[PDB]
């Protein structure tokens, strides 16, 4: 009943944390495999981590929990595990790597930093409470340290629980309503867009994650005229309505023109370039905001942990980003991708099973 | 009514953020004055910041707000401004610096880092929502940048709103219930312990802040035996009860002995060394937790933003810390102060007034 006692099921055909409505906090933990971590070792690793998530998400201490009193109040804690391209070579399982699971191709907007890119193994931990989250992260590292090195850890947040109603769209650190057009969990379009059905059999019921750390150049954004800001996106700042409508969820009319005959939503508006007509081909956007550090003279380092889930990186992610990589895409003046990683996310498990057992077992 | 629409009054005899029950998130912003920032400039600065807090805490955009749509949902946003020792020399107001407002004396446990210590000007921003908080921080830096350089920014969190009931004690990242013995806002003991009445007149109705960034050596803490953990503190881990009682709020009996004649609460137990018999001399503890970064092999960098408020640093803070600085203080094995700063926090203001006007006006 409480924000603190509420739980998310750990077991199911799918891993939690994907269809789960985004919780208030997230940590994306990126791990590289140690020299001796092969197929057997990854099995022991995933069995450890599986049981940790199984207990902690239900508010129970992990086995050998160093802080058992931090286990209760799970606050909708979820774990989502993902396998990077390198994990299949280390496992001797190159035959099982999906064809599209590989570093994204270069984009003109890219300013990618190694310290925010790549990784053999992802542990994505989401939770409505940051103390519960912190404990879950320590326990993960307690069992992963023998097998892996920490490549990076990216921390993000959304609104605190209760600040806005459930399902209402939340704003990003540019002040924009962010998440209006999105596959809805528990619809035909969602399952077909998100859950893998083709390709190697182990991944069916899983998905893929494209995780891109995108900096917001807020100093430049601030000085941008507000009417220019709406022209660049294709929607109004306060209402979130498309420029052709009046309410946030009005459907963007990409054929409307104005008095002078010009498109109401501009040719390079961000919702035009990013739109895909076929809903079943769309990506699931499930981002978190980040805010990290200030320089001496007061420049912010903040932006978006852009988390995209799709059944097929080549069909559903790369074309959109390629289309965004154009010159007239005005949002590129104010955003800069500084990190890129891709992960194959296995199906869920039941009792007696473990995450990744279909691949590594 | 909502966690998001709830507000804290900005105006009053005292600044908010001190007696205010701690909100879910905090940022402590440490600023050093630029070479040209004297008494007149500090007046313009404090008038800018005052009006920013006045509007933003009530869910209204600041003047020249770059992200006005991030102003609503204030979520109990508060600002607390503090003046460092150097601020009085730059203002030509050395006569008005409280005698005790100076860097803390050295302690044996100290491992102080310049990047977490000192500062001429504090902006402490607390809020139940991290997006609201982030916007408030950007607006603060927007108006402070011309006058100051950012020395440090320390970010901290407690439970999310709704995870525990109001007033229930929350745990720290060592799993300990933290905050049981504390002056209660709106009692004689609180007002006498917290609000300045003696010393220079401008500070009456204000207070002082001792802000110490204290790292938790969690790798060592984890390997410490649980019964040893309770012996070191003087209280039980799950219940929070003193070793002489059964419930969290039972009064510690510092005269009880066991069968063998030995003190039940040990001579160097952390609640014994830190206890002050006279409640009116106690400090107000209002800490935040921090969790920042992992090394390659999985060591955490986490701990406590220990925020202590008192009318008199020499009478109410330094003796306790000095008493904690002893050799048998076992908590010192697992905690390390890595940052120290002190601030004089002015009284509040009304409309037509501004924070610090009694000092700088
Ligand atoms: C910091 C970077 C970005 C910001 C601030 C941003 C912002 C927005 C905003 C304000 C909207 C309209 C509201 C909504 O429907 O969510 C939107 C829509 C969308 N964005 Fe972005 N976006 C960013 C990056 C990206 C990237 C890299 C992609 C890559 C695929 C992407 C894909 C989409 C899609 C598919 C939509 C839905 C458009 C539609 O069909 O109406 N966004 N974004
Ligand atoms: C990371 C460092 C620290 C940790 C983990 C810690 C933890 C605790 C715990 C678990 C308690 C008992 C529960 C409570 O009443 O809050 C306590 C009490 C207390 N602590 Fe600490 N503490 C730390 C540092 C400090 C420091 C530096 C001071 C400096 C004055 C201090 C002053 C006090 C006081 C006054 C009490 C109340 C004791 C009583 O009269 O019963 N603590 N602390």
What does A226-291 look like in DSSP terms, one character per residue?
Answer: HHHHHHHHSB-TTT--BTTSSSTTSPP-TT-B-TTS-BSS-TT-HHHHH--SSGGGPPEE--EEEE
- Give me the phi and psi of A301, to 5 degrees please: -120, 95
Contacts of A159 in chain B (CB under 8 A): 4, 73, 129-131
Q: Whose CA is nearest to atom 7 of ligand 2?
A: B178
Confirm whether residue B196 is marked as ligand binding.
no
C-alpha A182 – ligand 1 centre gap (Å) = 10
Closest ligand to Cα B104:
2
The token pair that represents B125 in the structure block? 């921003």
Contacts of A216 in chain B (CB under 8 A): none
The token pair that represents A76 in the structure block? 């909708």
DSSP H helices, chain A, are 39-56, 85-90, 130-144, 188-194, 218-223, 226-233, 270-274, 318-324, 357-360
Question: How far apart are the C-alpha atoms of B158 and B156, rounded to whole Å?
Answer: 7
Contacts of B154 in chain A (CB under 8 A): none
Residue ranges of domains in chain A: 2-361
Question: How far apart are the C-alpha atoms of B322 and B113, rounded to whole Å?
Answer: 19
Where is chain A broken, named by the residue before each break, C–N > 2.5 Å?
none
Which H or E run contains B231? helix B226-233
Which one of A209, A210, A271 would you pick to mutate in the ligand 1 pocket, going by the greatest count of ligand atoms within 8 A of its CB?
Answer: A271
Residues with CB under 6 A from ligand 2: B 172, 174, 176-181, 214, 216, 233, 235, 252, 270-271, 274-275, 304, 306, 320-321, 324, 335
- DSSP β-ladder status, A300-310 and B25-33: unpaired
- Nearest beta carbon to residue A164 from set B4, B130, B238: B4
Closest ligand to Cα B242:
2
Phi-psi group of B343: left, alpha or beta (phi > 0 → left; psi -120 to 50 → alpha; rest → beta): beta
Question: How far apart are the C-alpha atoms of A229 and A236, rounded to whole Å?
Answer: 8
- List Cα–Cα distances, B298 to A149, A361, B341, in angstroms: 7, 26, 29
Q: Whose CA is nearest to atom 35 of ligand 2?
A: B274
Question: How far apart are the C-alpha atoms of B251 and B247, rounded to whole Å?
Answer: 9
**A142 contact partners, CB below 8 Å, separation of at least 6:** A64, A66, B222, B298
Closest to B335 in 3D by CA, of B170, B111, B181: B111
Work out the number of other CB atoms within 10 angstroms of the CB of residue B262. 9
**B146 contact partners, CB below 8 Å, separation of at least 6:** B34
- Give me the phi and psi of A190, to 5 degrees please: -65, -55
Contacts of B300 in chain A (CB under 8 A): 138, 141
CB B233, CB B270: distance < 8 Å = yes
Phi-psi group of A125: left, alpha or beta (phi > 0 → left; psi -120 to 50 → alpha; rest → beta): beta
> By what method was this entry solved?
X-ray
Which chain B residue shows the shortest CA-CA distance from A165?
A: B2
Closest to B94 in 3D by CA, of B317, B311, B344, B355: B344
Question: How far apart are the C-alpha atoms of B100 and B95, rounded to whole Å?
Answer: 13
Closest to B304 in 3D by CA, of B227, B241, B222, B210: B210
Q: For residue A285, how many C-alpha atoms fall within 13 Å in the half-sphere facing its CB?
A: 20
Q: Do B67 and A174 touch (CB under 8 A)?
A: yes
- DSSP E strand boundaries for B161-295: 170-171, 177-178, 207-216, 284-285, 288-294
Q: Which position among A65, A120, A178, A312 bears the catalytic label?
A: A178
Query: What value, to the nearest 5°, has the Cα angle with vertex A77 and ends A73 and A82?
Result: 155
Which one of B22, B274, B340 would you pick to mutate in the ligand 2 pocket, going by the greatest count of ligand atoms within 8 A of its CB?
Answer: B274
Phi-psi group of B43: left, alpha or beta (phi > 0 → left; psi -120 to 50 → alpha; rest → beta): alpha
Question: How far apart are the C-alpha atoms of A24 and B163, rounded to whole Å?
Answer: 12
CB A269, CB A233: distance < 8 Å = yes
Which chain A residue shows the shortest CA-CA distance from B74?
A: A163
Question: Given the CA of residue A282, which atom of ligand 1 is nearest to it?
Answer: 35
Q: What is the 3-state secondary structure (H, E, C) of B13-61?
A: CCCCCCCCCCCCEEEEEEEEECCCCCHHHHHHHHHHHHHHHHHHCCCCC
Closest to A158 in 3D by CA, of A23, A293, A11: A23
Work out the number of other CB atoms within 10 angstroms of the CB of residue A277. 7
- List Cα–Cα distances, A113 to A58, A103, A340, B137, in angstroms: 36, 13, 8, 26
Question: How far apart are the C-alpha atoms of A108 and A130, rounded to whole Å?
Answer: 36
Q: Do A298 and B144 touch (CB under 8 A)?
A: yes
- Give me the phi and psi of A314, to 5 degrees please: -70, -35
Question: How far apart are the C-alpha atoms of B173 and A13, rounded to whole Å?
Answer: 33
Q: Whose CA is nearest to atom 31 of ligand 1?
A: A274
DSSP H helices, A120-269, are 130-144, 188-194, 218-223, 226-233
Shortest Cα–Cα distance, A319 to chain B (Å): 31
C-alpha B300 – ligand 2 centre gap (Å) = 22
**DSSP track, B87-145:** HHHHTT-GGGS-TT-S-PPP-TT----GGGS--SEEEEEEES-HHHHHHHHHHHHHHHT
Q: Specify which residues A303 forms β-bridges with.
A: A215, A290
CB A216, CB A302: distance < 8 Å = yes
Question: How far apart are the C-alpha atoms of B111 and B340, rounded to whole Å?
Answer: 10
Residue count of chain A: 361
Would you call A296 helix, strand, or coil by DSSP? coil
**Tokens 């600065």 -> residue:** B45
- CB-neighbour burial class of residue A176 (10 A; exposed 0-12, middle 13-18, buried 19+): buried
- Nearest beta carbon to residue A134 from set B160, B293, B302: B302
Q: Specify which residues B30 forms β-bridges with.
A: B122, B152
Question: How far apart are the C-alpha atoms of B56 and B41, rounded to whole Å?
Answer: 23
- Give me the phi and psi of A64, to 5 degrees please: 60, 35
């Amino acid at each position: 009943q409480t924000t603190g006692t509420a739980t998310e099921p750990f077991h199911g055909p799918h891993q939690a944390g994907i269809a789960t409505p985004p919780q208030a906090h997230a940590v994306f933990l990126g791990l590289d495999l140690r020299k001796g971590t092969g197929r057997k070792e990854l099995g022991r690793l995933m069995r450890l981590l599986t049981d940790d998530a199984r207990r902690l998400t239900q508010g129970r201490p992990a086995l050998a929990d160093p802080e058992p009193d931090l286990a209760p109040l799970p606050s909708r804690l979820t774990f989502t595990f993902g396998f990077g391209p390198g994990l299949f070579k280390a496992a001797g399982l190159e035959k099982q790597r999906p064809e599209g699971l590989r570093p994204l191709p270069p984009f003109k907007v890219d300013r990618l930093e190694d310290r925010w890119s790549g990784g053999d193994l992802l542990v994505q931990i989401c939770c409505d409470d940051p103390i519960t989250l912190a404990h879950a992260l320590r326990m993960t590292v307690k069992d992963a340290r023998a097998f892996t090195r920490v490549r990076w850890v990216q921390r993000g947040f959304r609104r605190s629980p209760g600040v806005q109603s459930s399902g209402a769209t939340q704003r990003n650190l540019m002040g924009q309503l962010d998440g209006t057009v999105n596959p809805v969990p528990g619809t035909a379009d969602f399952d077909q867009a998100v859950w893998v059905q083709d390709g190697p059999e182990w991944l069916r019921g899983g998905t893929t994650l494209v995780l891109r750390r995108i900096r917001m150049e807020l100093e430049k954004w601030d000085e941008a005229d507000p009417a220019g800001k709406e022209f660049a996106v294709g929607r109004r700042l306060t209402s979130g309505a498309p420029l052709t409508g009046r309410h946030e969820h009005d459907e963007p009319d990409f054929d409307a023109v104005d008095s002078a005959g010009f498109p109401v939503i501009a040719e390079n508006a961000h919702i035009r370039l990013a739109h895909v007509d076929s809903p079943r081909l769309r990506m699931l956007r499930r981002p978190y905001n980040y805010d990290e550090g200030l320089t001496a003279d007061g420049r912010s380092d903040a932006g978006l942990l852009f988390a995209a889930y799709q059944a097929d990186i080549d069909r559903q992610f790369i074309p959109v980003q390629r289309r965004l990589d154009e010159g007239g895409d005005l949002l590129n003046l104010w955003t800069t991708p500084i990190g890129s990683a891709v992960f194959a996310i296995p199906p869920g498990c039941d009792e007696n099973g473990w995450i990744g057992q279909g691949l590594l077992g």
